Write an enzyme that holds these catalytic residues in place. Structure first.
Site, PDB file in Angstrom:
ATOM      1  N   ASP A  35       0.828  -1.197   0.000  1.00 33.36           N
ATOM      2  CA  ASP A  35       0.000   0.000   0.000  1.00 33.36           C
ATOM      3  C   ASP A  35       0.868   1.255   0.000  1.00 33.36           C
ATOM      4  OD1 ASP A  35      -1.907   1.909   0.241  1.00 33.36           O
ATOM      5  OD2 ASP A  35      -2.443   1.424   2.334  1.00 33.36           O
ATOM      6  N   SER A 199      -0.528  15.701 -11.962  1.00 33.34           N
ATOM      7  CA  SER A 199      -0.778  15.358 -13.347  1.00 33.34           C
ATOM      8  C   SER A 199      -0.994  16.629 -14.159  1.00 33.34           C
ATOM      9  CB  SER A 199      -1.986  14.415 -13.436  1.00 33.34           C
ATOM     10  OG  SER A 199      -2.385  14.183 -14.772  1.00 33.34           O
TER      11      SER A 199
END
Length: 330
Positions: A35, A199
């Protein structure tokens, strides 16, 4: 040193991925959910409330000659999906794919929430976010990666998740045969303890690319792609019959649909998520309403590049002094 381990989807929807991990002496192999959005290595154990164990393999520290109680240490964690676990702490030897760390904090669960009990395939979590998020008190502990880092050939790990197929986590090297083209690296903020990056935009299907900054985290422990409501609405508007359902808890679409791809930007590079990766199947067994793999982050408080996004790429988690993230097509 290096390590290399195969990671395998737990079910037919790629809800999560499990990777075998050796703990203790002699080895006890547990299948852990790696994770990158958390920083605790915790396991089902001989200490876990019996009614909360349903098929998991447990770690039994009393059977390990190298286990030592970390006296006074406790831990307690809550995840974004509302699940939780807590317990006490041992140190022991932990190996992943041939890479060994001695003195790793192994957090033994005394209690786990229902979501963990119900998932018989997940024996615990191995956190790979920054150690500043580790929940052990009163002495915070380091992640497996942080402990391994100095011994690694290169201070990196890579995630190469499969779509309905096994993939690989590598530690200490970049497998240049595992991706196509070049790797594009992008800046990371560690301010919130995550692999947080920005992004450069998105496209829906064959549509034009929209240049827009989207801050989010690379999180292997989250199944879906969670993005701003504007972006998600633009995506689902291209699917006839798709709608957001408050009763179901997100966007659903007709199971008869063919989904468009979704592209996200990494600098000037582009990663394309095929439409099929965005199909999470019937909302309930036999339903003709299907659950979407792109969902709104509104009310989470952070955008999450979960498995839906990451499995479309070869992803480098660069833990050098200035951390960065790399993405390549594959």
């Amino acid at each position: 040193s290096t390590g290399s381990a195969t990671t395998t989807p737990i079910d037919s929807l790629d809800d999560a991925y499990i990777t075998p991990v050796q703990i203790g002496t002699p080895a006890q192999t547990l299948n852990l959910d790696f994770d990158t959005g958390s920083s605790d290595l915790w396991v089902f154990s001989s200490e876990t409330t019996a009614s909360e164990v349903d098929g998991q393999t447990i770690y039994t520290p009393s059977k390990s000659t190298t286990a030592k109680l970390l006296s006074g240490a406790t831990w307690s964690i809550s995840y974004g999906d509302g699940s939780s676990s807590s317990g006490d702490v041992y140190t022991d030897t932990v190996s992943v794919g041939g890479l060994t760390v001695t003195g790793q904090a192994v957090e033994s669960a005394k209690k786990v929430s229902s979501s963990f009990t119900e998932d018989s395939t997940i024996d615990g979590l191995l956190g790979l976010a920054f150690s500043t998020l580790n929940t052990v008190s009163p002495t915070q502990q380091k992640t497996f990666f942080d402990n391994a880092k100095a011994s690694l050939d290169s201070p990196v790990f890579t995630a190469d998740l499969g779509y309905h197929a096994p993939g690989t986590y590598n530690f200490g090297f970049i497998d240049t045969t595992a991706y196509t083209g070049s790797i594009t690296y992008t800046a990371v903020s560690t301010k919130q303890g995550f692999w947080e990056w920005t992004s450069t935009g998105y496209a829906v299907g064959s549509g034009t690319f929209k240049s827009t900054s989207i801050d989010g985290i690379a999180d292997t422990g989250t199944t879906l792609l969670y993005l701003p409501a504007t972006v998600v609405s633009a995506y689902w508007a291209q699917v006839s019959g798709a709608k957001s359902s408050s009763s179901v808890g997100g966007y659903v679409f007709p199971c008869s649909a063919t989904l468009p791809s979704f592209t996200f930007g990494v600098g000037s590079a582009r990663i394309v998520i095929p439409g099929d990766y965005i199909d999470f199947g019937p909302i309930s067994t036999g339903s003709s309403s299907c659950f979407g793999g792109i969902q709104s982050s509104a009310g989470i408080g952070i955008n999450i590049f979960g498995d839906v996004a990451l499995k479309a790429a070869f992803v480098v988690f660069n833990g050098a002094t200035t951390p960065t993230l790399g993405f390549a097509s594959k």
